[PDB]
Design an enzyme around this catalytic site. Structure first.
Site, PDB file in Angstrom:
ATOM      1  N   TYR C  58       1.108  -0.956  -0.003  1.00 16.10           N
ATOM      2  CA  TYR C  58      -0.175   0.528   0.092  1.00 16.10           C
ATOM      3  C   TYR C  58       0.636   1.550   0.127  1.00 16.10           C
ATOM      4  O   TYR C  58       1.311   1.791   0.918  1.00 16.10           O
ATOM      5  CB  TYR C  58      -0.964  -0.139   1.462  1.00 16.10           C
ATOM      6  CG  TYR C  58      -2.113   0.730   0.871  1.00 16.10           C
ATOM      7  CD1 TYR C  58      -1.989   1.627   0.030  1.00 16.10           C
ATOM      8  CD2 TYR C  58      -3.448   0.102   1.534  1.00 16.10           C
ATOM      9  CE1 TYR C  58      -3.419   2.331  -0.350  1.00 16.10           C
ATOM     10  CE2 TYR C  58      -4.754   1.577   1.853  1.00 16.10           C
ATOM     11  CZ  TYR C  58      -4.342   2.823   0.326  1.00 16.10           C
ATOM     12  OH  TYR C  58      -6.209   3.245   0.478  1.00 16.10           O
ATOM     13  N   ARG C 242      -6.412  -2.863 -17.132  1.00 18.56           N
ATOM     14  CA  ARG C 242      -7.612  -1.082 -16.377  1.00 18.56           C
ATOM     15  C   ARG C 242      -6.550   0.027 -15.955  1.00 18.56           C
ATOM     16  O   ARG C 242      -5.874  -0.687 -14.829  1.00 18.56           O
ATOM     17  CB  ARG C 242      -8.594  -1.843 -15.851  1.00 18.56           C
ATOM     18  CG  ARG C 242      -9.269  -2.877 -16.623  1.00 18.56           C
ATOM     19  CD  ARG C 242     -10.468  -2.147 -17.669  1.00 18.56           C
ATOM     20  NE  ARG C 242     -11.607  -2.876 -17.692  1.00 18.56           N
ATOM     21  CZ  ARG C 242     -12.468  -2.247 -18.769  1.00 18.56           C
ATOM     22  NH1 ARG C 242     -12.944  -1.494 -19.079  1.00 18.56           N
ATOM     23  NH2 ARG C 242     -13.544  -3.698 -19.077  1.00 18.56           N
TER      24      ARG C 242
END
Lengths: 460, 465, 460, 465
Positions: C58, C242
């Site tokens: 993260y 994507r």
């Protein structure tokens, strides 16, 4: 020569309807007692100046940057007006600037808002019913075009909660703090508001309209010592025409020690662009002339004597009301306005005002601090800025208080006859009821005998 | 002691400075030639009504919904004023409502804006250099100047520079793409009439309201010499001075009654503009109205309903046509060929000069004029046209031959402008031109011209007193 | 215990429902002819990159200005990705910058809008029905948060009316003009739009999502020659995951003639602040790795050979469809798409496309100039690059042309039997007829046997 | 030929650079010790589902209202995912609706904002330096940073600096003055539970909605160890990772059914949030959803409904309490006294230091943490607290003694930080601290500590592959 006389025919011969209307209005104002803080009478000089030939000349622009020609006399007149405005409050011309182009107080406030707030910004001002927006819709344009979060006065002691104000300011990050009020007899702490605005980097705007004359005589501490922008009007204190004035700071704002350079103010250009051609167009030259005349008349010792007489007569009225057994809330008052509570007497404020209007007596109704009911406002407000101008004295204000006592006795009699449980509609039905109308008629006639003695300033 | 005299001393004895200023201003206006379109002289009745005691009474609120007591006389006066306003334009009271609370034209425009546009909406009005007003929307690519462009989104349409008429086709094509909420029909420099029928058709096609601004032609509508826009427009904002010879105030006419009928259900839909306008005017923007202004407007409207006003407007338009033909006889280029109103726009590009220099030279010889850009100009700071207005002088008694004499005077002034421009060269600046105005070379000529025009103006009286 | 298996059991053992769903989806994709221009097939490398351990990390911020510690590998990966992105289009790193943090095309558009439009501004772009806002309500967020008016092409020829665009932009004063298309397959004059933007002092925006990879092969003129900010997607041409990319200009904007100074571009910092921490938070490292792999694979000669095969197959399919009597509109197109019309035959595109979906043929309706109604469409758009990625050849495209001809014949037969005045549900019910079901089953078996020969790229 | 070799080549053979980068990242994650709260390792099933062919299929639209064809499998997958989402929290399908189309937490928050707040409205969320999130509104005096502060008007409320609990009284007093349209209930660095009943009462008194954000507790509510806010809150937005072991996605739960009944007419009012949220999600902000993300979150939700998930959450909270008691025994000041969730906040002002230097010193010895300001800090540039997260290590199989060893390592690191700070003085800057850290004198000690903690951490496996 009726074609040429059409532009020279007097008002009495041209239109008799408006002539009779004006005559009846003057007769009513002469024989009717007025007790309203915002009501006053203008001098004859400003009335003669309003009817001058300046209503025809169009004067868009500023001196030196006008759009049309032949504005030398207009520029000289406005320069004299602004010089008298700066000298009336004893302000340094190098640090203070004044503008008299706004038509009234609300257009001046809106122009200041468009100049400084950058609409959709954030403002912090005083709450409306405590001396404005709702959850369903927005009424005032300040709430429509700008975002505002009001701060509430303390309901126990009756003073501004400065700690909560600082917290809400540092949490909300406003752009302008409104140091103005409509019903607040206590003096505001301008130094604390100034230091709060300096800590948050926002501006401070004061509204000294209702005390515009009180600051002229030095009875109330001047707010120009701390506030940056000071907006006010010309009537209700100075006996002038309807207009607005904007005071802004000039010079060096604050020198920056980080770079050793200084920062100059920029409020003057923003305000000048916001007034014209922002909102208004051609100013009213007659209004500027009347404002200049009123400001010149206010810079005399007679104005200070009149203000001292005003405060003395207000103190005498408060003492006379306290003597007869009335409860004056908020420990009297520190200004001309007087607020009394008639809840313990057994009479409503609106009903008392209606019965007083029935006997040619004027007054005002407003809510009390710590609002408890919006349907029954018992904060009956009194003020005598106009009676002092007419020539009233404390010995005459004793008889005025006796008349007010007779009126409150009439209201008590009406409430005992119609019933304290009766609604407002059947009470309004019994104002002109014959049952006691003769008594009411008596309460009129003597009042007239007291009103015809004092003259009425204005045109003969 | 002196407190009784302080509130009763005349202005001549109280303040001699403002008294001398007013006297000098009146002396200047008496011997001057005023050719500004938005310029006139109010009657003595309005001046006497303005200086009444109504300035002392506070009349916040509306009739029947007042906040204070003892407002019977003020309510009666305002009712009489609104009745005279409704009768002056021959409007049905059941279908039209009038409001006179706005202080002037721009406050009335801003009130209509905050009432109907729903701020941050879209507005389409006339462009400023094409004869529009500042309240009709004006903004540049750098920043926004007018408050209408700041609080709302305005996209003004252009005028046809070839023929001089408003390009209705371009407006109709842009309305389908911009989808405006209110169409402004208002002109400040335009010598022709507007096609209100096509504007109403476009507004109905786009489902928007129509706000007409009959500031200059207002008095003309009072005379019936100009087609009234009340047949198609929904809202109509107008002034009181300019040509109607009244005090500085504004009036707003709005539609009432049934707006449309549902063909399916049959329910009658009523107008809702009255309540919105009343809420926007007070306590929206303004507070306590000016009772003296209302009385002056009522007096002016009562005086306008006479035949003398119609005769005066006919004389105004006749003198306008006479001045136009006398000026085009001298070879001056007139835009659009003629004029259907009191204002005219004279183009100076046929003489090899601009409007600013000619306006300044006329100002030097006590001739009131104003500059304005022409349709098709390459710059706004260098206007080539001059705007002239007839009714300012027609209110004093000027005639056709007198108007031709004034036209010859302006021709001599233009000759003086050409001489001064040729004396300083073609590559000079405007500051050098202004310095040449005050020069000793042309001092005698401009002095003689000023003396002649002052002697000519001293023959006509000046209303007032 | 069970904790060693809960985080280690395969998808087949953990959940059998989603496993069977994915198996059925892969089986359907194996036997079929995906004729959509947007659909494609990504390589196995990006599929393995998406399933990497980068999903756990993260990270927030940009390289050199991170918030957490131990982000050297993520910074190196992002630097490699941006370098490959700059090298894929042959752009000077000193004049062009690329950002891959936006999640998709619409997030990147919203980010560049909040960066350069200053919301409640003005935008000018193409509308929806010409290749968007209603009269009553607003659908797209662009019309909600920003004010915009669209410009429409001429109805006769169908090209952009640049003169009307200039006339509208001279009065509208736009802040950013975009240049994008989804169904208008004609080239745009970027030089004229750049001149318009320079005249109005605005910026130019480009949307190369449909031709992105086509710019990598040099078949379409690159819009980077005039446009300032160019946004694009990663899939439908480049066979990637994507994600979205934003290209912005860098260097000197223009020279200042006042004092010989120069103005430098500031779009980089604005776009960076709008992307993070403006709208999004922690970027997807797996998506960055996938788009990096796709960009590295696109810089090979095999990509140009694939694009040449795509355009050759498109030309062959257009010729084969024109030979069979099908009227191709606008002479086909330029880069990759074709559009067959069925209005001459009588049947609409909707019935044809639903019969095609019934016989395992993937097609879709589209709004084009001429089809004034979406419920009864007349345009049937197809897609070439999918079949080329699956390995179809010229004779294979001719066989697909024969198949679509047979499908159109079957649709015409169904329409003639059910009647031309029948409704849509009547056509749905007639599609389930016995002989019609047998015919569509035979056609499905034929197309499945045809597609079974060619492999399917992806995971084994 | 070339297509069989290009589209089928493995990642190791095609691109070796990204392969080496991924290998180095995996080695760092396996050998390194992570203590960040918003960190977790997803299962292998989610990783396999993410790499499926669902990335190729386009699913633009909603089930039952699709635009393209051949989406029956995607519709069934989305239906199964939404059913598992509704059943995971034990919610009535007739009263609750779930949407998984938003890409992440921030897009879902922005969609809820543009759907319910009516932009240019007023919002009230938790302050950023007081444990709140950035999407909950954050702005300064100079400019607006967060998009929520740009498009909306946000005024955050602060936390009590004395006790550390949320001051509900000040929030209730400020709600009447600010008049908000939506109250945000969310945090990221708060170790206590939220009083959702008080917030619901305040919202009902102010007539506003209550938007909850259970991101950091997305797993805690799944195991029932934390009271669910669905009993009072209307709309609840959450993530799919952090503490849920899923891919990058976001979920939105909204109320359905009857909201209230009219006491006068007796007619019941139905909720309208479903249509607004669906329109704001698509085609409002996002376009085509990610089918692979939907499959991954469905797998994660099915795995979370087992008893192993509840046992894991109990182990997480037990290890968190053990680490808290160890830190209190070690003489370190703990904010608010304890922790009722997975994360803890350790204050360093009791030892005479700050968290900024300690974070980098711990990072030097392979200890991952994050700095954060403490309630009462006069400057956000010098944070004093450090946030530690237990579920990141609990997913590998650590116990109470392991967390005690990590606490001892953190204590030794804090001692080394204090030594380095005393070596360079207090008046030194952070850059001088970084330069002094490069010296071998302390580099040898931090390298020994790093080797020790790496050898301790290498004894545990790493899920994935």
């Amino acid at each position: 020569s009726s074609h040429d006389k059409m532009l020279a025919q007097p008002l009495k011969d041209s239109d008799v309807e408006v002539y009779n209307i004006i005559k009846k209005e003057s007769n009513r104002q002469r024989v009717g007692l007025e007790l309203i803080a915002s009501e006053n009478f203008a001098s004859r000089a400003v009335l003669e100046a309003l009817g001058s030939c300046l209503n025809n000349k169009y004067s868009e622009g500023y001196p030196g940057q006008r759009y049309y020609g032949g504005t030398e006399f207009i520029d000289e007149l406005e320069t004299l007006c602004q010089k008298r405005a700066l000298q009336a409050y004893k302000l340094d011309p190098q640090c203070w600037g004044v503008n008299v182009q706004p038509y009234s107080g609300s257009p001046a406030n809106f122009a200041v808002y468009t100049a400084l707030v950058e609409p959709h910004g954030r403002i912090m001002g005083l709450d409306l019913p405590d001396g404005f927006m709702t959850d369903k819709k927005k009424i005032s344009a300040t709430s429509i075009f700008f975002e505002s979060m009001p701060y509430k006065v303390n309901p126990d002691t009756g003073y501004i909660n400065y700690d909560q104000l600082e917290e809400n300011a540092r949490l909300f990050h406003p752009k302008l703090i409104i140091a103005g009020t409509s019903c607040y007899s206590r003096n505001l702490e301008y130094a604390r508001l100034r230091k709060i605005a300096d800590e948050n980097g926002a501006y401070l705007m004061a509204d000294m309209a209702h005390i515009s004359g009180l600051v002229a005589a030095g009875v109330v501490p001047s707010p120009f010592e701390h506030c940056h922008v000071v907006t006010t009007t010309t009537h209700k204190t100075l006996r002038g025409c309807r207009a607005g004035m904007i005071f802004y700071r000039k010079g060096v704002k604050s020198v920056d020690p980080k770079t050793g350079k200084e920062i100059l103010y920029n409020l003057e250009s923003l305000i000048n662009s916001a007034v014209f051609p922002g909102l208004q167009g051609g100013p009213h030259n007659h209004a500027i002339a009347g404002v200049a005349v009123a400001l010149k008349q206010a810079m005399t010792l007679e104005f200070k004597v009149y203000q001292h007489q005003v405060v003395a007569n207000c103190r005498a009225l408060s003492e006379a009301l306290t003597e007869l057994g009335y409860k004056i809330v908020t420990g009297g008052s520190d200004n001309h306005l007087i607020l009394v509570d008639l809840r313990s007497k057994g009479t409503d404020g609106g009903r008392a005002e209606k019965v007083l209007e029935a006997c040619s007596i004027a007054c005002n109704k407003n809510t009390c601090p710590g609002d408890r009911s919006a349907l029954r406002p018992s904060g009956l407000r009194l003020g005598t800025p106009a009676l002092t101008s007419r020539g009233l004295l404390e010995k005459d204000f004793q008889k005025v208080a006796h008349f007010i006592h007779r009126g409150i006795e009439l209201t008590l009699q009406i409430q005992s006859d119609t019933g304290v449980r009766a609604t407002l509609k059947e009470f309004k039905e019994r104002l002109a009821g014959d049952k006691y109308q003769a008594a009411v008629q008596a309460l009129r006639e003597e009042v007239e005998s007291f009103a015809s003695l004092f003259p009425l300033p204005g045109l003969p």
